[PDB]
Amino acid sequence: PRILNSDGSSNITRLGWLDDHYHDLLTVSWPVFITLITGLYLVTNALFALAYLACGDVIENARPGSFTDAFFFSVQTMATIGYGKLIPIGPLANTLVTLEALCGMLGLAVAASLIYARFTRPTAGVLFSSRMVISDFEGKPTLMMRLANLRIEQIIEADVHLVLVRSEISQEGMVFRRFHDLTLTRSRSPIFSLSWTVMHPIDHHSPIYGETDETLRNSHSEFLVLFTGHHEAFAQNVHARHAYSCDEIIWGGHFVDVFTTLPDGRRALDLGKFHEIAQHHHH
Amino acid sequence: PRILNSDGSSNITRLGWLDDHYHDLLTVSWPVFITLITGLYLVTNALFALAYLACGDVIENARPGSFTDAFFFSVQTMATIGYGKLIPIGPLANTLVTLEALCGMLGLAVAASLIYARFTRPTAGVLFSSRMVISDFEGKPTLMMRLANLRIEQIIEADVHLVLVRSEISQEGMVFRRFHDLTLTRSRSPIFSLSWTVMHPIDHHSPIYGETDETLRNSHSEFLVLFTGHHEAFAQNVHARHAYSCDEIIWGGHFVDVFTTLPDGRRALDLGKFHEIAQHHHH
Amino acid sequence: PRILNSDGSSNITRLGWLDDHYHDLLTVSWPVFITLITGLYLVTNALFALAYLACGDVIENARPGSFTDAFFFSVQTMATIGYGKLIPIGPLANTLVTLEALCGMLGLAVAASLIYARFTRPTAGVLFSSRMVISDFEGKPTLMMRLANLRIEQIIEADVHLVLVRSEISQEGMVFRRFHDLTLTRSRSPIFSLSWTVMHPIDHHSPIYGETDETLRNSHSEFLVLFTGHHEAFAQNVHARHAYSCDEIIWGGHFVDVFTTLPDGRRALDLGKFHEIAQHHHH
Amino acid sequence: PRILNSDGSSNITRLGWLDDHYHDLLTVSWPVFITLITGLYLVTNALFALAYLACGDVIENARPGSFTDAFFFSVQTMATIGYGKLIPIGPLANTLVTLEALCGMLGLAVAASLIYARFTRPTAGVLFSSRMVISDFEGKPTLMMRLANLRIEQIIEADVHLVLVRSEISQEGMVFRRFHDLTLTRSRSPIFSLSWTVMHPIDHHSPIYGETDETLRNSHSEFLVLFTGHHEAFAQNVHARHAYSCDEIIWGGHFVDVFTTLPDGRRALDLGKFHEIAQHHHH
Ligand SMILES: [Cl-]
Ligand SMILES: [Cl-]
Ligand SMILES: [Cl-]
Ligand SMILES: [Cl-]
Ligand SMILES: [K+]
Ligand SMILES: [K+]
Ligand SMILES: [K+]
Ligand SMILES: [K+]
Ligand SMILES: [K+]
Ligand SMILES: [K+]
């Protein structure tokens, strides 16, 4: 019954047409988006066609009062194919022409931006260790997890937040969900390129100080990770979030190592070991 | 007589043609913007038409020395419909043609950017509690208000500023308007997704320490909120501002709660309670 | 003989073809940029024309082996006007056609981006007080200057740096130019909308502590201001820089005030007073 | 056998089709990218051609059941040249027409964004001193290197990180690679315009305190520099990274100076001296 999902998205039921047009257009599925555009496209040409007929027989080589002919003329006109069978006749016909044109291009201009707006979304090639571990490092127990960059490109000024979320009681006795950002021994990495093992020493300042497993379940406490950085691949900012539950903390565990020396004598990164955590079993 | 409006825009009278072209183009209303473009469009084609006539009878199937014909030819040419009745004749005619073309496309290129520039403005789906409240939390009186995200998408590295604005006297006795940023118990939220109740503990460091209501009215003091964050919906930064007056502070009040358990046993968010503030009435 | 100009640009002589293509294209003057594009345009069509002739007489209604005809055909083809007199003949002709097309549009795609890239540059509507002043505020002498927003739109999370630049001697006796960022009583303004008077208290920590005018000239010291913020007008970041010389510091001066009450009883901002500094003359 | 290359890219062997489409399209070489586009272009027209034939003899002046004719018609249609020899016949023909059109433009819209996305990548005109030096400045030994801006345009809010990377042993005896950000006497430069000499004083807090050369080789320690700032040229953010090995530290060295006075009496910047480091040789 987790508040937060693994993908880091909160797991709550929300209780609440043309209002949010721009968001909606970027939020819709490509199929749908394309449909909408299409609809709009067809629609407007039909409207234009009517405008033509409305004048009456103003297009060369058009079957008299036939909408199809007018419609297809309108497309050839608005897409500026301008084949040349169907042609404007008289001032009214042409004005509508020079109006459509502009309309068509403006539409392109609007379509483009939408396309580009929806199209240009990078994704940090970042992978999160499936588990966290609590274990002694440099003489203090430390909570850690680790990120691996999945692409050859590097992430610049990358940095990460480790946030504990759990239920608390106020002195006034208000029982709420609170967020604690957890001090990391290293929160910035100006050049993230291969793997980064993030650590929160646990000492008298850690909100998880002197806490066992049972105490963690008890406050229904989870751990939220936000990673962000500027990706050289996209020359644009990227982010990635992940969440862990009390039970994905492997106490006493140690992340295995991912840095190897090849037979060749060349250093390497093995991402098979990435999710592997060493453990002592005491019968 | 408030200095700051609810929308957060300052409420002052300012005392001050082609100077600010780019701003103006992004600032104008869509109707107007479209008009301007249109004007420009029509205009330039007329100019081009004249260029054609100026050569004299250089277009196939054009009524001799008729501007309409030339004009419409110019559009068919510049929009590149190129129907094919009206056609260039001779070097002069065509050079103008190949010039227009380029002109037309450049215009498209310019129109597009404007369109996209004006079109691509997101808006944080963020809603501000209509009121603030001053009340004891964890043993210190605290000023608070709260934000609710209005969309399913999440806001990353969101953060908020609570700024007190009020009149002060210098030792030198200059009576000015000063801004005090108010320390919040939590000013960053790397993953804002549902509701956030922001708090400024009031203690010996709060510029509103040991201040009653009467003292607040007296310094004609308001409270300004700036929220900002990176919206996953738009993959782009968003912001939202709000302002409160001395009298929108509900002393002793407590925001009601918006987190519920459904019959289903599924957690939920009710935004009807969002503006509701509990209060003790003592006859 | 100032190191830094008023516009904030350093005032030094630098001592140092296709190398920096992208920068150069955004850096060139519009006239030039347009020329380049034009050149490129004409050029490529000529090349294409030759390709056509090279096949030999492959265009309907083209004077045999005439470059003009081929050239103009090439434009009508690459701009996709496609009038219809000149037409491809045979596989070779048309392949070149379908190649040009694509070429043309790609060019548009490239032109557009350049245009948009160069076109979309906002400018903070920000005006800098022509002078600084050193005067007592709240019981410490303070260096100040002030910014006024020149537009109705607001600047968000605006902030400013006041940097002293002057010559110094190391213990080792290296005589260099050093930069001192000067602590401001207020360095962030989350919502900058009208005027902001920036202040650097001078106390035992100010690098300009117990410094007279003569001492300032002596270190050939200037003051550099960088302002930056997110402009609502453009929904994009803006910046502005300014520089002051030792002699634009008006000692004992006080900026006059720009906030007024109208006859109407409505508050206002007068930017005529903006550059005016009060002063005591002692015969 | 360096972990980090001079260009700042880590020097490790990584061990790991349509999966990463967007990255891949921005990552591919221009030749390849253009090819892909071309392929896609040709391909789709062929598909469309088949659609036409499939209806059977629906294009004016087309050799019966000939794919070439159909293909070339399809291009003239999708690029909207619309010459006018080949023309649609009947509802089926034209519907396909009005479909292609839209398709073509959408493709343009998609191509454009890619182009612009890949095209609009600035590069900080920044040059890194080929060496570092350790030498006494203001009475403490200091590690330094220096950056020179290579262009007339200025970089705003520029800042730099000096990161030591070397092997360490935990109390628990885990022998890992750790990153130490090194405190710089000056880490921000709001207006970087000519040269900046960055310094890390070495004192009891420097992770390189009381370290000789032999000790540096021994921890196989390198130094990584990340520079970033907002480039006025591009009105966009830029970055640059560099790395140094233990042996590119010139102990006792002093960077020569690059600031000169011309015969004219005008100040100047000489970038020939930029890589030159003074040194005392003691036989
Ligand atoms: Cl076990
Ligand atoms: Cl009451
Ligand atoms: Cl005087
Ligand atoms: Cl030697
Ligand atoms: K066309
Ligand atoms: K077009
Ligand atoms: K056409
Ligand atoms: K035609
Ligand atoms: K664009
Ligand atoms: K952009």
Q: Report yes or no: D134 and D197 within 8 Å, Cβ to Cβ.
A: no
Residues A73 and A181 both lie in one domain: no
Nearest-CA neighbor of A95 among B72, B101, C98, D265? B72
HEC assignment per residue over B51-70: HHHHHCCCECCCCCCCHHHH
DSSP, collapsed to helix, strand or coil, labels residue B228 as strand
d(CA A86, CA A74) in angstroms, rounded, equals 9
Residues C47 and C143 both lie in one domain: no
Cβ <8 Å between D113 and A136: no
Q: Residue A2: what residue type?
A: R
Residues of B in contact with D80 (CB under 8 A): 80
Tokens representing B150?
């209005």
Tokens representing B60?
């196939």
Nearest-CA neighbor of A158 among A186, A182, A130? A186
Residues of D in contact with B82 (CB under 8 A): 81-82
Nearest-CA neighbor of C207 among C174, C161, C173, C163? C163
D255 C-alpha to center of ligand 4: Å? 18
d(CA B5, CA B241) in angstroms, rounded, equals 10
DSSP, collapsed to helix, strand or coil, labels residue A260 as strand
Residue D265 backbone class (left: φ over 0; alpha: ψ -120 to 50; beta: rest): left
Nearest-CA neighbor of B81 among D22, A11, A98? A98
**Helical packing angle, A90-119 and D90-119, nearest 10°:** 50
Tokens representing B255?
């925001």
**DSSP assignment, residue C96?**
H
Residues of D in contact with B117 (CB under 8 A): none
DSSP, collapsed to helix, strand or coil, labels residue B133 as strand
Residues A223 and A179 both lie in one domain: yes
Q: 3-state DSSP: chain C helix, strand, coil percent, rounded to 5?
A: 30, 35, 35
d(CA B73, CA B89) in angstroms, rounded, equals 13
Cβ <8 Å between D81 and C102: no
d(CA D267, CA C120) in angstroms, rounded, equals 34
d(CA C122, CA C225) in angstroms, rounded, equals 19
Q: Provide CB contacts within 8 A for C259, sequence distance 6+.
A: B12, B177, C195, C267, C268, C269, C270
Tokens representing D258?
């690059």
Triad A203, A205, A206: Cα angle to 5°:
70
Tokens representing B151?
């969309």
Q: Report yes or no: D251 and D136 within 8 Å, Cβ to Cβ.
A: no
B121, HSE (Cβ side, Cα atoms, 13 Å) = 15
d(CA D197, CA B264) in angstroms, rounded, equals 64
A266, HSE (Cβ side, Cα atoms, 13 Å) = 10
DSSP, collapsed to helix, strand or coil, labels residue B201 as strand
Resolution of the experimental model in angstroms, please? 3.3
Chain C: touching chains (3 or more CB pairs < 8 Å): A, B, D
d(CA D143, CA D255) in angstroms, rounded, equals 11
The last residue of a domain, from among B76, B97, B122: B122
DSSP string for D79-101: TT---SSS-B-HHHHHHHHHHHH
Chain D interface disruption, residue of A81, A157, A266, most D CBs within 10 A: A81
Q: Parallel, antiparallel, or unpaired for β D236-245 and D175-181?
A: unpaired
Q: Which residues in C243-268 are b (16+ Cβ under 10 Å) and which e?
A: bbbbebbbeebbbeebeeeeeeeebe
Tokens representing D156?
């705003």
Residues D196 and D274 both lie in one domain: yes
Q: Report yes or no: B52 and B74 within 8 Å, Cβ to Cβ.
A: yes
DSSP string for A16-45: ---TTHHHHHHHS-HHHHHHHHHHHHHHHH
* H/E element, B210: none
Would residue B237 count as lying in a domain?
A: yes
d(CA C82, CA D75) in angstroms, rounded, equals 12
Would residue B7 count as lying in a domain?
A: no
Q: Report yes or no: D223 and D211 within 8 Å, Cβ to Cβ.
A: no
* Cβ atoms < 10 Å from Cβ of D232: 20
Residues A171 and A152 both lie in one domain: yes
d(CA B248, CA D122) in angstroms, rounded, equals 49
Residues B26 and B129 both lie in one domain: no
Question: How far, CA to CA in Å, does D280 sit from each of A126, D135, D240?
Answer: 49, 11, 32
Distance, in angstroms, between A191 CA and closest chain D CA?
Answer: 7
Q: Is C185 exposed, middle or buried (0-12, 13-18, 19+ CB in 10 A)?
A: middle
Q: Is B136 exposed, middle or buried (0-12, 13-18, 19+ CB in 10 A)?
A: middle
Cβ <8 Å between C113 and D136: no
Distance, in angstroms, between C70 CA and closest chain A CA?
Answer: 21
Q: Report yes or no: A246 and A217 within 8 Å, Cβ to Cβ.
A: yes
Residues of C in contact with D122 (CB under 8 A): 22-23
Residues C137 and C238 both lie in one domain: yes
Q: Where are the beta strands (DSSP E) in chain C?
A: 13-15, 126-128, 132-137, 140-149, 155-169, 175-181, 188-192, 195-201, 222-231, 236-245, 249-251, 254-255, 259-261, 267-270, 277-278
Beta bridge partners of B197: B146
Chain D interface disruption, residue of A26, A83, A199, most D CBs within 10 A: A83
**DSSP assignment, residue A109?**
H
User: Where does chain D break, by residue before each gap (C–N > 2.5 Å)?
Assistant: 16
DSSP string for D25-59: HHHS-HHHHHHHHHHHHHHHHHHHHHHHHHH-S-B
What are φ and ψ of residue D250, in 5° steps? -95, 95
Distance, in angstroms, between B171 CA and closest chain A CA?
Answer: 40
Would residue B240 count as lying in a domain?
A: yes
Tokens representing D111?
């191509």
Nearest-CA neighbor of A134 among A43, A203, A189? A203
Residues C140 and C112 both lie in one domain: no
d(CA B229, CA B240) in angstroms, rounded, equals 9
What are φ and ψ of residue A104, in 5° steps? -65, -50
DSSP, collapsed to helix, strand or coil, labels residue B106 as helix
Q: Provide CB contacts within 8 A for A36, sequence distance 6+.
A: A25, A28
Residues A145 and A204 both lie in one domain: yes
Nearest-CA neighbor of D122 among B1, A179, A122, C118? C118
Q: State the first-to-last Cα distance of chain B, in angstroms, to the nearest integer.
A: 31
Q: Where are the beta strands (DSSP E) in chain B?
A: 13-15, 126-128, 132-137, 140-149, 155-169, 175-181, 188-192, 195-201, 222-231, 236-245, 249-251, 254-255, 259-261, 267-270, 277-278
Cβ <8 Å between C80 and A84: no
Nearest-CA neighbor of A84 among A100, A60, A67? A60
d(CA C34, CA C13) in angstroms, rounded, equals 30
Q: Is C28 exposed, middle or buried (0-12, 13-18, 19+ CB in 10 A)?
A: middle
Triad D135, D137, D141: Cα angle to 5°:
50
The last residue of a domain, from among D69, D103, D122: D122
* H/E element, B257: none
d(CA A277, CA A254) in angstroms, rounded, equals 5
Residues A211 and A100 both lie in one domain: no
D174, HSE (Cβ side, Cα atoms, 13 Å) = 13
Q: Parallel, antiparallel, or unpaired for β A132-137 and A140-149?
A: antiparallel
Residues of B in contact with D84 (CB under 8 A): 84
Q: Parallel, antiparallel, or unpaired for β C254-255 and C277-278?
A: antiparallel
d(CA D69, CA D59) in angstroms, rounded, equals 9
Tokens representing A158?
């990358």
Nearest-CA neighbor of B278 among B178, B80, B124, B144? B144
* Domain around B104: 20-122
Residues B164 and B67 both lie in one domain: no
Tokens representing D161?
């990180």
The last residue of a domain, from among C92, C122, C152: C122
Nearest-CA neighbor of A26 among B153, D118, B115? B153
The residue of chain C nearest to residue D262, with distances taken between CA atoms, is C13
**Helical packing angle, D90-119 and A30-55, nearest 10°:** 130
Cβ <8 Å between B79 and A81: no
Would residue D64 count as lying in a domain?
A: yes
Q: State the first-to-last Cα distance of chain C, in angstroms, to the nearest integer.
A: 31
d(CA B159, CA A161) in angstroms, rounded, equals 14
Q: Report yes or no: B62 and B70 within 8 Å, Cβ to Cβ.
A: yes
d(CA D95, CA D83) in angstroms, rounded, equals 18
Residue D94 backbone class (left: φ over 0; alpha: ψ -120 to 50; beta: rest): alpha
C55 C-alpha to center of ligand 5: Å? 25
Q: Where are the beta strands (DSSP E) in chain A?
A: 13-15, 126-128, 132-137, 140-149, 155-169, 175-181, 188-192, 195-201, 222-231, 236-245, 249-251, 254-255, 259-261, 267-270, 277-278
Q: Report yes or no: C228 and C159 within 8 Å, Cβ to Cβ.
A: yes
Chain B: touching chains (3 or more CB pairs < 8 Å): A, C, D
Residues with CB under 5 A from ligand 7 (ion): A 80, 82; B 80, 82; C 82; D 82
Which residues of D touch chain B, with CB atoms under 8 Å apart? Answer: 80-82, 84
Report chain C's C-alpha Rg in angstroms. Answer: 30
Cβ <8 Å between A191 and D91: no
Residues A69 and A140 both lie in one domain: no
Would residue C200 count as lying in a domain?
A: yes
DSSP, collapsed to helix, strand or coil, labels residue C45 as helix
DSSP string for A71-94: HHHHHHHHTT---SSS-B-HHHHH
**DSSP assignment, residue A253?**
-
Residues of B in contact with A88 (CB under 8 A): 72, 83
Number of residues written out for chain B: 283
DSSP string for C187-229: -EEEEE-SEEEEEEE-STTSTTTT--HHHHHHTT-EEEEEEEE
Chain D interface disruption, residue of C106, C164, C170, most D CBs within 10 A: C106
Q: Provide CB contacts within 8 A for C89, sequence distance 6+.
A: C57, C58, C59, C60
Which among A1, A10, A27 has the least Cβ separation from residue B193? Answer: A10
Would residue D9 count as lying in a domain?
A: no
**DSSP assignment, residue B272?**
S
* H/E element, A117: helix A90-119
Would residue D14 count as lying in a domain?
A: no
Q: Report yes or no: B230 and B236 within 8 Å, Cβ to Cβ.
A: yes
- Interface B-D, measured as beta-carbon pairs within 8 A, has a size of 5
Which residues of C touch chain A, with CB atoms under 8 Å apart? Answer: 80-82, 84
Would residue B107 count as lying in a domain?
A: yes
Q: What is the CATH number of the domain that holds C144?
A: 2.60.40.1400
Question: How far, CA to CA in Å, does A56 sit from each of A47, A73, A101, B20?
Answer: 14, 14, 20, 46
Question: How far, CA to CA in Å, does D43 sit from each of B242, C80, D47, D48?
Answer: 54, 20, 6, 9
Q: Report yes or no: B101 and B218 within 8 Å, Cβ to Cβ.
A: no
The number of distinct structural domains making up chain B is 2
Q: State the first-to-last Cα distance of chain A, in angstroms, to the nearest integer.
A: 31
What are φ and ψ of residue C234, in 5° steps? -95, -10
Q: Residue D119: what residue type?
A: F
- Interface B-C, measured as beta-carbon pairs within 8 A, has a size of 148
d(CA D93, CA B79) in angstroms, rounded, equals 24
Q: Provide CB contacts within 8 A for D38, sequence distance 6+.
A: C102
DSSP string for B72-83: HHHHHHHTT---
Q: What is the CATH number of the domain that holds B41?
A: 1.10.287.70
What are φ and ψ of residue D267, in 5° steps? -70, 155
What are φ and ψ of residue A34, in 5° steps? -60, -45
Q: Residue C244: what residue type?
A: Y
DSSP string for chain D: --SB-TTS-B--EEE---TTHHHHHHHS-HHHHHHHHHHHHHHHHHHHHHHHHHH-S-BTT--TT-HHHHHHHHHHHHTT---SSS-B-HHHHHHHHHHHHHHHHHHHHHHHHHHHHHH------EEE-S-EEEEEETTEEEEEEEEEE-SSS-EEEEEEEEEEEEEEE-TT--EEEEEEEPPPS--EEEEE-SEEEEEEE-STTSTTTT--HHHHHHTT-EEEEEEEEEETTTTEEEEEEEEEEGGGEEET-EEPP-EEE-TTS-EEEESSGGG-EE-----
